[PDB]
Write a protein that binds this ligand. Structure first.
Ligand SMILES: [Zn+2]
Ligand SMILES: [Zn+2]
Ligand SMILES: [Zn+2]
Lengths: 124, 77, 153, 48, 713, 252, 97
DNA sequence: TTAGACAAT
DNA sequence: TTGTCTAA
């Protein structure tokens, strides 16, 4: 049991585990508990966000949905004079689609509340 | 007018030495003479005994207010 | 080369479309320039010119009077790549689609004509204007990747 | 929702439109943040 | 490169106005075929490329990026008819059993629905001093003049709920307190329960219509299947008449009844719906086969409408009639199967839905969101060891050629990372995995030295994932963890040719270990602030006590409580070479001169004593500038335990004045008494506890470590 | 206890058969150990146990075994992982005409698997070796399956099983593999008085406290397993095994 | 297990603020000083009266550890010894509360 | 005022 | 197996 740059799963891309080889080590609920009781917020930040499923997410600061931005296709101008920008469809504007730092499990939570017709305002 | 603890607490020292040790890494400039170590935590902890770490701390009171204490003026235990 | 030349030798006369004014930025600075911040901010801005973004809408060509905003810099949670904000009298360029610029020819053939705007803009100008087989205006303007701006027309 | 019966509390947090401002240790790890614990109770500045 | 800095401030999650999704969407799907026969994802299907891509070798159809950096694209399954909203179905039935058919108002009296309408806009400001003031003044008004003529508002209830909004105008932010959300949950639950009794209509003297909910899928009106297509026409006209109160019950988004009624089901992106094999039913995903069942029933209803355009539906229950309520309740139960599985108790071909993904302990909030499987961690068996310090741990060589820590190149650490790159990733004086200035990495191998030295010439002119060394911190974890010292941060030490983790004896009273194959998780904090709070806050030496009462829990266990009672007894006498061997066995790489003592007996022979060896050890392990400590007290062996003969009472001598009960350390030197568990075990108020509450943590770790090494040797 | 299970290892096909190379009959044994004649299958080795708190690693249910005595053969073992491989209960795609075989011109099976697709007898296997290969008879396309276990093992014998009639096609087999499994750090011993001790550290022989008779010990046992557990029977067994090996006797 | 989990998740937020009042994760004030006097549980072990002879010796050993108390500022007992003399005067005149 | 219903170990 | 929530 030694783990580094291992294979993640395709949903919730944190390390796999699952009673076999090449599986990561669970941190755990009571370890969350005890490490908050220590007072070290950043070792918990490391072992619970920085080392498993850290993702970059794009939100329009006006509305605040992780679903609303949409990136264009590259132009057929053959890699010259090309934009590579984002388009918030609910705003129809090429501005303030900023980047944030949230877990990839939280993006599955947001794009899975959208299956339940819920959307989260993020104050950004 | 700042009335909090004049003593630096333990978590203050942990974050100040952590960020200061990352304010040593990535070719960042150091302000004391060194006997030659490669661990940045030793370097950052020798500047704490030097009172040379310039960091200002925004101690968030729960209203949303803060006081600006300086690690130069905080009394270590 | 981006040439300063005493604030671009004041080319903000008529027929040139550019506006120069104060702004507000967000510079993510490395901790190697804790002390000696002036050359760090201006070297990152020299490594920032000749492309498009939002706070500097079209494209920049120069900047002067880089003054830092506020007393305190911002150190975030785990990053340590310290974040300062700048107000500075920029000399930036609005490309203004529908205008007429100049051209310095270096590489010209029957297939395409290469002319330069401000000695920095590698503008590829197509030679045939569908007139005949024996032989500027602006409609599309988009930047290239590596620190340059291009003009089609 | 993280504690117990997440479906009933998402119902009573969507019918009422509840908003939370993220000052809790159980919430500051649902999003990627640093809690208001010991080493997150203050932020950190450099003068000049 | 260009990492996000923009943080968050607060979240709020509400519902969808159904126009918004058709702009967020990509494709109307309508095809019951997942994959083709070769393995190609089928056209216009539920795993189409125009959704989030499922494979890594085909790009998606909307964007021209790979599976790695795609956001995730969603579509919609449109419906031929209207189904209920299962999130709001149990609050829909609680409205229609209080409403009326012909008049679109409700059976609640007007004093109650004015009182709640005034109390809710006071608790938005978070006044909470006025929620008794409103019931006081409306009881005074209803005592003065009871009437239904106050149709819109009373003058003083509305006047005070305007003054309480105008005073503290920015009070939308002061309402995150427990007491405000307490009353706001309590009053709305009291209106949902106590004042929603199904009864007759009071103001126009008209017969009511009572609906009934049966098996959580059908609403039966009483003159009986109420179609949701007619519940649209009921609920819209009810809400356009009662919106000024039902927007204060339901904050939401402008809150219209497009959220009570679902006209199309939205699919999640197909990258979040993984593939599955080797089960009872292969090649299936649960939230994909639920929407497969929905889409099959939508094909069935389009067949029914094709029949009603002027068998084909022998499969439903009543094929003879032309109308078929039964297919519509079939579709609405398939929507319940999508959102849940607790509301359906009938259909045997279902998989658990999005409630079951989230709620219970094997879900997300208790399985993937609050505790995650982590990279850069190790798990191995623990065994005893004592030649490591108490703030130390022995990390087998296999872990140390496989657990690697990141380090950027300063001018101070050019040479050591250069040597580590020279080593290559198998040999441990330190080795490497270097990653360049961009996201591209090298991942250098040990098959050849030429490439390694060629990289090693270009380190300063790039950080290195260097292997763990003899000063690094690993975070140690033995589950179950029930208290604060059950996860501590031990300094690594790299010991050659081992398989088991190795701990000192003081620490396995904290971890509640037994050295019988108890396997232990050793997390390795990869970042650099995570090192610093582990050196300072989560250090082993700093947490010597217990959070229950503050009693010690680091001490020496078995051989040492016999060697301390044998060595520090009065009878021991060492010569010069034995003393100078024991003192240096107790120490190891003491940086300075070892400050020895004089003989306790100078003639005939230079005999030391067992107490002076412990004293020499104390004076050498207490730091250089700090003067040694005084102490007094009492030990575990009493005075009745050293007696052999019958004691005779001499006249003027109390035997406890000269007794071995009293440990009377003076200036850091033992002058009386026997050391026991009472002075260097887990027992409070002893030597290694006084050295904790005088000198600190690392000295009180060195006392336990050095008195272990002395008492074994 | 890993002991000597059975005498016929070749015609029995269990999953795991923990065998102990050279067990010994106990010198101090009750009369029921001989009324049932348990010396057909003995379970442990004698050991010169000295009760001393000598090393530092000898505490809290752990012990010290002599290193040279471990190197000379003390409680060496074996574990026989047998694996019944069937080409129809596992590998089923089409027509069930799967026999073991190698296709000529396959470099994956060169010198590692035999010309029938089964590995050699005596051939060591490691993680990543070809384990068997089976030839689809209808197309001609032979497959390969690899040894996906962590341990290193030696193919002891391979038995080719038919069906209950006698007309089964060559598709069932049962490979039996020795795995050495010597005492390593973390292997729990015990005496016969129920006092487990995990192996903590193999201490070299020149460091062992030699006696006045010239003997090093064999296993160091702690005095600190005794006062809480009160195994007087271990002390009398110690005196009795010493007095039986010094006299040739066998004690009741 | 379950009982400890529930007592955890109803007490996860009670951190001590800079103004030393035990407030919850939203500002809700539970206590004005932690534990009704303000102290900590690990650091109250040598405050009992039977461990005062230990602090009667070892005085210079702890003077070396931190010496704010004699010749440095923020060590004025005027506003508190005034207050304790007020309270002991009130018990001098009004013995039975 | 009392029986089904709902969640946790 | 509790203990409260909901419906008759
Ligand atoms: Zn938007
Ligand atoms: Zn895409
Ligand atoms: Zn009515």
């Amino acid at each position: 049991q030694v783990r580094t740059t291992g294979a993640r799963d395709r949903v919730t891309n944190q390390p796999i585990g699952g009673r076999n080889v090449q599986g990561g080590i669970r941190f755990g609920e009571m370890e969350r508990d005890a490490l908050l009781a220590h007072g070290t917020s950043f070792l918990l930040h490391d072992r619970l966000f920085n080392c498993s499923d850290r993702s970059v997410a794009h939100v329009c600061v006006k509305c605040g949905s992780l679903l609303s931005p949409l990136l264009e296709k590259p132009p057929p101008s053959w890699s010259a004079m090309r934009n590579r920008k984002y388009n918030c469809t609910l705003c129809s504007r090429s501005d303030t689609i900023d980047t944030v730092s949230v877990p990839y499990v939280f993006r599955y939570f947001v794009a899975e509340l959208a299956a339940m017709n819920i959307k989260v305002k993020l104050d950004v | 007018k700042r009335i909090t603890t004049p003593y630096m607490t333990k978590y203050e020292r942990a974050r100040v030495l952590g960020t200061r040790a990352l304010q040593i890494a990535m070719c960042a400039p150091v302000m004391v003479e060194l006997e030659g170590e490669t661990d940045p935590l030793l370097i950052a902890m020798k500047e704490l005994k030097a009172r040379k770490i310039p960091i200002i701390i925004r101690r968030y009171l729960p209203d949303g207010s803060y006081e600006d204490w300086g690690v130069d003026e905080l009394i270590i235990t | 080369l981006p040439t300063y030349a005493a604030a671009c030798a004041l080319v903000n006369s008529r027929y040139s479309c550019l506006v120069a004014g104060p702004h507000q930025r967000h510079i993510a600075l490395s901790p190697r320039y804790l002390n000696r911040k002036r050359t760090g901010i201006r070297e990152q801005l020299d490594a920032e010119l000749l492309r498009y973004s939002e706070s500097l809408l079209g494209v920049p060509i120069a900047y002067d009077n880089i003054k830092v905003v506020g007393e305190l810099g911002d150190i975030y949670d785990d990053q340590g790549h310290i974040h300062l904000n700048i107000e500075a009298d920029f000399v930036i360029f609005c490309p203004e689609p529908g205008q007429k610029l100049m051209g310095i020819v270096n590489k010209v053939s029957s297939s395409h004509i290469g002319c330069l705007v401000h000695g920095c803009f590698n503008a590829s100008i197509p030679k045939p204007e569908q007139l005949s087989a024996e032989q500027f205006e602006v409609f599309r303007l988009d930047s290239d990747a590596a620190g340059v701006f291009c003009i089609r027309g | 929702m993280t504690f117990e019966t997440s479906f009933q509390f998402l119902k009573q947090a969507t019918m009422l439109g509840s908003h939370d401002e993220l000052r809790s240790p159980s919430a500051c790890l649902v999003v990627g943040k640093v809690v208001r614990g010991g080493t997150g109770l203050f932020e950190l500045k450099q003068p000049l | 490169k260009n990492m996000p800095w923009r943080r968050l401030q607060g979240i709020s999650f509400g519902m969808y106005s159904a126009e918004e999704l058709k702009k967020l969407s990509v494709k109307s799907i309508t095809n019951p075929r997942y994959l083709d026969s070769l393995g190609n994802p089928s056209a216009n299907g539920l795993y189409d490329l125009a959704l989030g891509p499922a494979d890594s070798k085909e790009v998606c159809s909307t964007c021209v990026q790979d599976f790695s950096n795609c956001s995730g694209h969603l579509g919609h399954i449109e419906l031929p008819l209207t189904v209920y909203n299962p999130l709001l179905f149990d609050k829909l039935y609680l409205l229609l059993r209080g409403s009326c058919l012909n008049c679109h108002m409700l059976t609640c009296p007007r004093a109650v629905i004015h009182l709640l309408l005034c109390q809710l806009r006071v608790l938005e400001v978070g006044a909470l001093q006025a929620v008794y003031e409103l019931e006081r003044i409306l009881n005074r008004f209803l005592e003065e003049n009871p009437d239904p003529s106050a149709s819109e508002i009373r003058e003083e209830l509305e006047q005070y709920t305007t003054e309480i909004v105008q005073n503290n105008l920015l009070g939308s932010q002061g309402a995150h307190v427990k007491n405000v959300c307490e009353s706001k949950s309590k009053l709305i639950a009291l209106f949902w329960k106590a004042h929603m009794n199904a009864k007759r209509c009071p103001h126009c003297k008209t017969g009511r219509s009572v609906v009934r909910k049966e098996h959580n899928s059908k609403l039966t009106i009483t003159f009986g299947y109420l179609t949701p297509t007619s519940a649209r026409e009921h609920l819209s006209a009810l809400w356009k008449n009662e919106g000024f109160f039902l927007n204060y019950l339901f904050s939401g988004m402008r809150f219209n009844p497009s959220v009570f009624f679902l006209d199309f089901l939205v699919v999640p992106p197909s990258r979040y719906r993984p593939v599955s094999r080797l089960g009872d039913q292969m090649f299936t995903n649960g939230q994909t086969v639920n929407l497969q069942a929905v889409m099959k029933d939508v094909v069935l209803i389009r067949k029914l409408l094709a029949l009603m355009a002027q068998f084909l539906s022998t499969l439903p229950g009543q094929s003879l009639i032309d109308k078929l309520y039964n297919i519509w309740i079939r579709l609405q139960s398939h929507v319940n199967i999508v959102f849940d599985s607790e509301m359906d108790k009938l259909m045997m071909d279902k998989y658990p839905g999005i409630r079951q993904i989230l709620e219970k302990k094997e879900g997300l909030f208790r399985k993937h969101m609050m505790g995650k499987r982590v990279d850069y961690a190790a798990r191995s068996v623990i065994c005893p060891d004592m030649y490591i310090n108490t703030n130390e741990i022995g990390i087998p060589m296999v872990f140390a050629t496989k657990l690697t820590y990141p380090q950027p190149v300063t001018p101070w650490n050019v040479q050591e990372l250069r040597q580590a790159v020279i080593n290559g990733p198998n040999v441990h004086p330190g080795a490497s995995m270097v990653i360049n200035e961009d996201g591209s990495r090298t991942a250098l191998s040990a098959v050849d030295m030429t490439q390694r030295e060629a990289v090693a010439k270009q380190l300063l002119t790039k950080i290195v994932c260097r292997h763990v060394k003899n000063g690094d911190i690993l975070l140690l974890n033995r589950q179950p963890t029930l208290h604060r010292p059950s996860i501590q941060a031990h300094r690594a030490r790299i010991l050659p040719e081992e398989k088991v983790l190795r701990l000192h004896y003081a620490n396995c009273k904290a971890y509640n270990a037994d050295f019988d194959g108890d396997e232990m998780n050793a997390h390795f904090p990869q970042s650099e602030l995570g090192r610093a709070e582990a050196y300072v806050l989560a250090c082993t030496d700093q947490q010597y006590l217990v959070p229950k009462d503050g009693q010690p829990l680091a001490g020496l266990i078995q051989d040492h409580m016999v060697s301390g009672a044998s060595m520090t007894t009065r009878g021991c006498f060492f010569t010069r070479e034995h003393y100078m061997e024991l003192v240096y066995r107790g120490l190891t790489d003491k940086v300075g001169r070892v400050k020895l003592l004089s003989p306790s007996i100078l003639k005939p022979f230079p005999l030391w004593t067992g107490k002076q060896v412990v004293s020499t050890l104390l004076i050498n392990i207490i730091p250089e500038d700090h003067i040694p400590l005084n102490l007094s007290g009492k030990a575990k062996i009493t005075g009745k335990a050293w007696v052999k003969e019958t004691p005779r009472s001499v006249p003027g001598f109390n035997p406890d004045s000269m007794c071995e009960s009293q440990v009377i350390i003076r200036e850091g030197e033992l002058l009386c008494g026997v050391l026991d568990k009472a002075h260097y075990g887990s027992s409070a108020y002893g030597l290694v506890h006084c050295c904790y509450e005088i000198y600190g943590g690392e000295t009180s770790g060195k006392v336990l470590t050095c008195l272990a090494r002395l008492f074994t040797a | 206890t890993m002991g000597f299970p059975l005498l016929t290892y070749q015609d029995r096909s269990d999953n795991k058969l923990y065998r102990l190379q050279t067990p010994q009959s106990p010198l101090v044994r009750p009369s029921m150990y001989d009324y049932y004649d348990m010396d057909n299958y003995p379970i442990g080795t004698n050991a010169i146990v000295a009760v001393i708190s000598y090393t530092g690693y000898d505490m809290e249910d752990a012990m010290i075994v002599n290193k040279a005595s471990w190197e000379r053969g003390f409680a060496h073992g074996s574990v026989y992982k047998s694996e019944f491989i069937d080409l129809s209960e596992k590998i089923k795609q089409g027509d069930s005409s799967l026999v073991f075989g190698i296709k000529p011109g396959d470099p994956r099976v060169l010198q590692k698997l035999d010309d029938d697709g089964l590995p050699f007898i005596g051939a060591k296997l490691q993680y990543g070796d070809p384990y068997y290969s089976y030839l689809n008879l209808n197309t001609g396309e032979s497959f390969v399956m690899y040894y996906k276990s962590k341990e290193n093992c030696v193919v002891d014998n391979i038995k080719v099983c038919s069906n209950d009639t006698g007309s089964g096609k060559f598709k069932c087999v049962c490979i039996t593999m020795r795995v050495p499994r010597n005492p390593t750090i973390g292997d729990k011993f015990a005496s016969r008085h129920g006092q487990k001790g995990i192996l903590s550290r193999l201490w070299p022989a020149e460091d062992m406290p030699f006696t006045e008779s010239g003997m090093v010990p064999d296993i160091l046992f702690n005095p600190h397993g005794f006062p809480s557990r009160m195994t007087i029977g271990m002390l009398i067994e110690s005196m009795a095994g010493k007095s039986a090996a010094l006299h040739g006797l066998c004690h009741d | 297990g379950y009982l400890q989990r529930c007592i955890i998740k109803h007490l996860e937020g009670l951190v001590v603020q800079y103004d030393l009042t035990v407030r919850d994760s939203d500002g809700s004030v539970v206590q004005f000083l932690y534990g009704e006097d303000g102290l900590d549980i690990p650091k109250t072990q040598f405050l009992q009266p039977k461990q005062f002879p230990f602090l009667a010796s070892n005085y210079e050993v702890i003077m070396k550890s931190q010496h704010l108390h004699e010749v440095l500022s923020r060590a004025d007992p005027k506003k508190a010894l005034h207050h304790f003399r007020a309270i002991k005067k009130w018990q001098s005149k009004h013995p039975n509360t």
